[PDB]
Design an enzyme around this catalytic site. Structure first.
Site, PDB file in Angstrom:
ATOM      1  N   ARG A 177      33.623  46.994  30.152  1.00 36.51           N
ATOM      2  CA  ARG A 177      33.650  48.303  29.509  1.00 36.51           C
ATOM      3  C   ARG A 177      32.229  48.622  29.056  1.00 36.51           C
ATOM      4  O   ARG A 177      31.859  48.351  27.926  1.00 36.51           O
ATOM      5  CB  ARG A 177      34.577  48.281  28.296  1.00 36.51           C
ATOM      6  CG  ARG A 177      36.037  48.025  28.606  1.00 36.51           C
ATOM      7  CD  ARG A 177      36.850  48.011  27.310  1.00 36.51           C
ATOM      8  NE  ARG A 177      36.332  46.998  26.390  1.00 36.51           N
ATOM      9  CZ  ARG A 177      36.428  45.685  26.590  1.00 36.51           C
ATOM     10  NH1 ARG A 177      37.031  45.203  27.671  1.00 36.51           N
ATOM     11  NH2 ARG A 177      35.903  44.849  25.717  1.00 36.51           N
ATOM     12  N   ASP A 242      36.646  37.924  27.775  1.00 35.49           N
ATOM     13  CA  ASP A 242      37.210  39.269  27.805  1.00 35.49           C
ATOM     14  C   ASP A 242      38.376  39.526  28.766  1.00 35.49           C
ATOM     15  O   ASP A 242      38.177  39.987  29.895  1.00 35.49           O
ATOM     16  CB  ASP A 242      36.077  40.258  28.112  1.00 35.49           C
ATOM     17  CG  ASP A 242      36.507  41.701  27.982  1.00 35.49           C
ATOM     18  OD1 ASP A 242      36.935  42.082  26.872  1.00 35.49           O
ATOM     19  OD2 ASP A 242      36.410  42.450  28.983  1.00 35.49           O
ATOM     20  N   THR A 243      39.583  39.218  28.313  1.00 33.23           N
ATOM     21  CA  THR A 243      40.820  39.443  29.060  1.00 33.23           C
ATOM     22  C   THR A 243      41.927  38.973  28.150  1.00 33.23           C
ATOM     23  O   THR A 243      42.816  39.746  27.794  1.00 33.23           O
ATOM     24  CB  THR A 243      40.925  38.659  30.400  1.00 33.23           C
ATOM     25  OG1 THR A 243      40.142  37.463  30.345  1.00 33.23           O
ATOM     26  CG2 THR A 243      40.489  39.522  31.552  1.00 33.23           C
ATOM     27  N   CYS A 348      44.182  34.672  39.510  1.00 31.26           N
ATOM     28  CA  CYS A 348      43.465  34.142  38.353  1.00 31.26           C
ATOM     29  C   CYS A 348      43.528  32.627  38.165  1.00 31.26           C
ATOM     30  O   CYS A 348      44.612  32.048  38.066  1.00 31.26           O
ATOM     31  CB  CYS A 348      43.951  34.824  37.081  1.00 31.26           C
ATOM     32  SG  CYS A 348      43.192  34.139  35.628  1.00 31.26           S
ATOM     33  N   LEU A 349      42.354  31.998  38.104  1.00 33.65           N
ATOM     34  CA  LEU A 349      42.268  30.552  37.927  1.00 33.65           C
ATOM     35  C   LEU A 349      42.515  30.156  36.487  1.00 33.65           C
ATOM     36  O   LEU A 349      42.756  28.983  36.197  1.00 33.65           O
ATOM     37  CB  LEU A 349      40.893  30.022  38.345  1.00 33.65           C
ATOM     38  CG  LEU A 349      40.585  29.721  39.813  1.00 33.65           C
ATOM     39  CD1 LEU A 349      39.190  29.149  39.897  1.00 33.65           C
ATOM     40  CD2 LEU A 349      41.586  28.731  40.387  1.00 33.65           C
ATOM     41  N   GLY A 350      42.453  31.125  35.583  1.00 36.36           N
ATOM     42  CA  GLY A 350      42.667  30.808  34.185  1.00 36.36           C
ATOM     43  C   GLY A 350      43.994  31.245  33.598  1.00 36.36           C
ATOM     44  O   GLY A 350      44.181  31.173  32.375  1.00 36.36           O
TER      45      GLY A 350
HETATM   46  C1  HEM Z   1      45.591  37.208  30.178  1.00 36.94           C
HETATM   47  C2  HEM Z   1      44.358  37.205  30.649  1.00 36.94           C
HETATM   48  C3  HEM Z   1      43.896  37.317  32.057  1.00 36.94           C
HETATM   49  C4  HEM Z   1      44.227  38.237  33.023  1.00 36.94           C
HETATM   50  C5  HEM Z   1      45.173  39.410  32.918  1.00 36.94           C
HETATM   51  C6  HEM Z   1      43.469  37.865  34.211  1.00 36.94           C
HETATM   52  C7  HEM Z   1      43.503  38.539  35.418  1.00 36.94           C
HETATM   53  C8  HEM Z   1      42.794  38.216  36.579  1.00 36.94           C
HETATM   54  C9  HEM Z   1      42.863  38.968  37.833  1.00 36.94           C
HETATM   55  C10 HEM Z   1      43.692  40.201  38.070  1.00 36.94           C
HETATM   56  C11 HEM Z   1      42.053  38.337  38.721  1.00 36.94           C
HETATM   57  C12 HEM Z   1      41.811  38.732  40.158  1.00 36.94           C
HETATM   58  C13 HEM Z   1      40.462  39.347  40.409  1.00 36.94           C
HETATM   59  C14 HEM Z   1      40.190  39.766  41.846  1.00 36.94           C
HETATM   60  O1  HEM Z   1      41.061  39.552  42.718  1.00 36.94           O
HETATM   61  O2  HEM Z   1      39.089  40.316  42.095  1.00 36.94           O
HETATM   62  C15 HEM Z   1      41.458  37.181  38.014  1.00 36.94           C
HETATM   63  C16 HEM Z   1      40.565  36.276  38.553  1.00 36.94           C
HETATM   64  C17 HEM Z   1      39.966  35.191  37.909  1.00 36.94           C
HETATM   65  N1  HEM Z   1      40.182  34.844  36.606  1.00 36.94           N
HETATM   66 FE1  HEM Z   1      41.406  35.768  35.258  1.00 36.94          FE
HETATM   67  N2  HEM Z   1      42.702  36.738  33.953  1.00 36.94           N
HETATM   68  C18 HEM Z   1      42.944  36.383  32.655  1.00 36.94           C
HETATM   69  C19 HEM Z   1      42.345  35.290  31.991  1.00 36.94           C
HETATM   70  C20 HEM Z   1      41.422  34.384  32.502  1.00 36.94           C
HETATM   71  C21 HEM Z   1      40.822  33.274  31.776  1.00 36.94           C
HETATM   72  C22 HEM Z   1      41.126  32.918  30.337  1.00 36.94           C
HETATM   73  C23 HEM Z   1      39.969  32.651  32.649  1.00 36.94           C
HETATM   74  C24 HEM Z   1      39.114  31.459  32.421  1.00 36.94           C
HETATM   75  C25 HEM Z   1      37.982  31.402  31.729  1.00 36.94           C
HETATM   76  C26 HEM Z   1      40.053  33.387  33.916  1.00 36.94           C
HETATM   77  C27 HEM Z   1      39.356  33.083  35.095  1.00 36.94           C
HETATM   78  C28 HEM Z   1      39.410  33.739  36.336  1.00 36.94           C
HETATM   79  C29 HEM Z   1      38.675  33.367  37.519  1.00 36.94           C
HETATM   80  C30 HEM Z   1      37.721  32.208  37.627  1.00 36.94           C
HETATM   81  C31 HEM Z   1      39.031  34.271  38.497  1.00 36.94           C
HETATM   82  C32 HEM Z   1      38.536  34.292  39.913  1.00 36.94           C
HETATM   83  C33 HEM Z   1      39.460  33.483  40.869  1.00 36.94           C
HETATM   84  C34 HEM Z   1      38.923  33.519  42.311  1.00 36.94           C
HETATM   85  O3  HEM Z   1      38.103  34.446  42.609  1.00 36.94           O
HETATM   86  O4  HEM Z   1      39.324  32.629  43.132  1.00 36.94           O
HETATM   87  N3  HEM Z   1      40.932  34.416  33.771  1.00 36.94           N
HETATM   88  N4  HEM Z   1      41.934  37.151  36.708  1.00 36.94           N
END
Ligand code: HEM
Length: 405
Positions: A177, A242-243, A348-350
């Site tokens: 943002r 930030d998520t 999402c990996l997290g």
């Molecule tokens: C409730 C919270 C969260 C939501 C709604 C969320 C959602 C998402 C979404 C929609 C993607 C897909 C992005 C794409 O396809 O371009 C993503 C990717 C990713 N997220 Fe999250 N996320 C959250 C929390 C987290 C946390 C806490 C971490 C860890 C620090 C994290 C790490 C990642 C990573 C590393 C990717 C990339 C995976 C890849 O490209 O193989 N996320 N997330």
């Protein structure tokens, strides 16, 4: 400001939705994005906002595009084009098969195994944080819990001093943002400058922290370079800073305005997990996209090579076609369908860390502070972007009603 319509984009498909500033933002951010799904909006539209780009408005298209990386590349995942072009985080900006290796190393630093060995701390931190607030009978949620909770855990995870939280947090927010002060590139460059020195040091000796694991990693053959390490760490900032942070505020804002749903969880603890998923569908908050690898006719529309398409992850679960009365929160929803953590090879990996923090929050909070509500006479404001969030959440309660466990 609107960008002139590219010759190849249909006359009738123009719906000027501004992903960073939706018209119906006043009725909630998810509600603002839901207009894109009204009876009179095409499944796939083109907006002249932010450089002009496509927008799949139905979970069917969204899910579909996210599965076809052959056409929809993650190379330029962000909007505007300047943001996506600059985006080079690994593996979030890579397409399979190149992604596999890096995503596997990244999975080592935030996957379930990591989350399990961290459960106790995560839980203790939530309690410690809540027990602190509890007697106050009031709090600024976003900053008193929604932020300290996920971030500290992430910082412990990455092995980064907590003093850097405000710094890293601000920059990260500029990628999701933008307040307008800096472009995406600059914010990214700033984060990279923070990481690089840290990567260099850690690259030497092993290390249990995320940065070490990545710095001492090995992708397809040779050892991981510093630049790769840098691009990999970056991909973790938005999620760790930030998520989750914003998600908790959405979910908690709702709980403060809905005693019914609160009572339900209070006296039916076992429902917390299912409640978490429903809130994840209802207050989903991410929306990024892909870039076209070639000219391609997708569902009647002719996309040209280089076009960007927004696939709001938050829209799938709001699509009435996938969830009846989507705007209603029903912890007993039989089939909670959504793409909140994404869809496809970039899932999402997290999400495991996310869910745990959400489950620990609901559990520890409702136990100690089951009865609370939004401070008297206050309007909660939302913000829309790559990751939508809540500006502030003034909560109040009577200390006498709280409990300590
Ligand atoms: C409730 C919270 C969260 C939501 C709604 C969320 C959602 C998402 C979404 C929609 C993607 C897909 C992005 C794409 O396809 O371009 C993503 C990717 C990713 N997220 Fe999250 N996320 C959250 C929390 C987290 C946390 C806490 C971490 C860890 C620090 C994290 C790490 C990642 C990573 C590393 C990717 C990339 C995976 C890849 O490209 O193989 N996320 N997330």
């Amino acid at each position: 400001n609107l960008a002139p319509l590219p010759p190849h984009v249909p006359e009738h498909l123009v719906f000027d939705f501004d992903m960073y500033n939706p018209s119906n933002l006043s009725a909630g951010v998810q509600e603002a994005w839901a207009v894109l799904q009204e009876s009179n909006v095409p499944d796939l539209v083109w907006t002249r906002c932010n450089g002009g780009h496509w927008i799949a408005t139905r979970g069917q298209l969204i899910r579909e595009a996210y599965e076809d990386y052959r056409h929809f590349s993650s190379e330029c995942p962000f909007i505007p084009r300047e943001a996506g072009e600059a985006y080079d985080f690994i593996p979030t900006s890579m397409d399979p098969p190149e992604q596999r290796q890096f995503r596997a190393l990244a999975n080592q630093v935030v996957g379930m195994p990591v989350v399990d060995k961290l459960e106790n701390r995560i839980q203790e931190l939530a309690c410690s944080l809540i027990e602190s607030l509890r007697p106050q009978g009031q709090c600024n949620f976003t900053e008193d819990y929604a932020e300290p909770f996920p971030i500290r855990i992430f910082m412990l995870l990455a092995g980064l001093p907590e003093e850097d939280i405000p710094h890293l947090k601000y920059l990260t927010d500029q990628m999701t943002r933008p307040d307008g002060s800096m472009t995406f590139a600059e914010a990214k460059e700033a984060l990279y400058d923070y990481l690089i020195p840290i990567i260099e040091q850690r690259r030497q000796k092993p290390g249990t922290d995320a940065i070490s694991i990545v710095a001492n990693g090995q992708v397809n053959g040779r050892p991981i370079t510093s630049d790769e390490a840098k691009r990999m760490c970056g991909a973790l900032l938005v999620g760790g800073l930030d998520t989750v942070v914003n998600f908790l505020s959405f979910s908690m804002e709702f709980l403060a305005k809905s005693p019914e749903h609160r009572q339900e969880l209070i006296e039916r603890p076992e429902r917390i997990p299912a409640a978490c998923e429903e809130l994840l569908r209802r207050f989903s908050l991410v929306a990024d996209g892909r870039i076209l690898t070639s000219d391609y006719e997708f569902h009647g529309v002719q996309l040209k090579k280089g076009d960007q398409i927004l696939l709001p992850q938050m829209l799938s679960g709001l699509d009435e076609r996938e969830n009846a009365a989507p705007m209603h929160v029903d912890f007993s929803r039989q089939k909670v369908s959504h793409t909140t953590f994404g869809h496809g090879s970039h899932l999402c990996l997290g999400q495991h860390l996310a869910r745990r923090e959400i489950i620990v929050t609901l559990k520890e909070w409702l136990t100690r502070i089951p009865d609370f509500s939004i401070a008297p006479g206050a309007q909660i404001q939302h913000k829309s972007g790559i990751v939508s969030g809540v500006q502030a959440l003034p909560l109040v309660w009577d200390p006498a009603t709280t409990k300590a466990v």
